[PDB]
UniProtKB/Swiss-Prot annotation:
UniProt miscellaneous comment: Present with 319 molecules/cell in log phase SD medium.
Subcellular location: Nucleus
Record's function text: Component of the Mediator complex, a coactivator involved in the regulated transcription of nearly all RNA polymerase II-dependent genes. Mediator functions as a bridge to convey information from gene-specific regulatory proteins to the basal RNA polymerase II transcription machinery. The Mediator complex, having a compact conformation in its free form, is recruited to promoters by direct interactions with regulatory proteins and serves for the assembly of a functional preinitiation complex with RNA polymerase II and the general transcription factors.
Organism: Saccharomyces cerevisiae (strain ATCC 204508 / S288c)
Tree of life domain: Eukaryota
UniProt record similarity statement: Belongs to the Mediator complex subunit 14 family.
Entire-sequence positions represented here: 697 to 832 of 1082
Name recorded for this polypeptide: Mediator of RNA polymerase II transcription subunit 14
Amino acid sequence: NRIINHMLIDSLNQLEIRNKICSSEMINEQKLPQYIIQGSNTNDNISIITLELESFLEGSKALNSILESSMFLRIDYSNSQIRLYAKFKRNTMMIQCQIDKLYIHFVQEEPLAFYLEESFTNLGIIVQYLTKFRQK
C-alpha cells in the first residue's frame, strides 16, 4: 500500500500535480473531513490523498473561487472505488437542483461537500480516471 501511494505520488508529479498523504496519524488527528473518514474502519485498503485544486486543474485559476483549494482522492482496493471529494467555497443554489444525472453525490453531513464516484479495474490508467473526474 505504501508503494502504491508513492507511485501515485510519482505519477501525479509526472502530471505536475501537488499532493499530500493522509497517513494514519493524519486520519487519527481528525483534521480531515469526517465523511471521508466514514467507511474507513481501520482498513489498509482505503487510501486518502489531499490534492491542490490549482494543481489538479493544471493551473486553472478561474475555478478557484467555486471549489475549495483542497480536494480529497479516496481509493478503496476492497471496493475498487475511486471517489473525488470537493468542498464548495460558497453555498450555491444550484445544489438544490437535481444533479443526479451527472453522477455527482453530495455529502449529507456537509451540503457544501460533493464527490464523484467511479469504478476502476487497472491502477495504471487511473490518470485517465482523474481526467474524467476533472472533466466532470
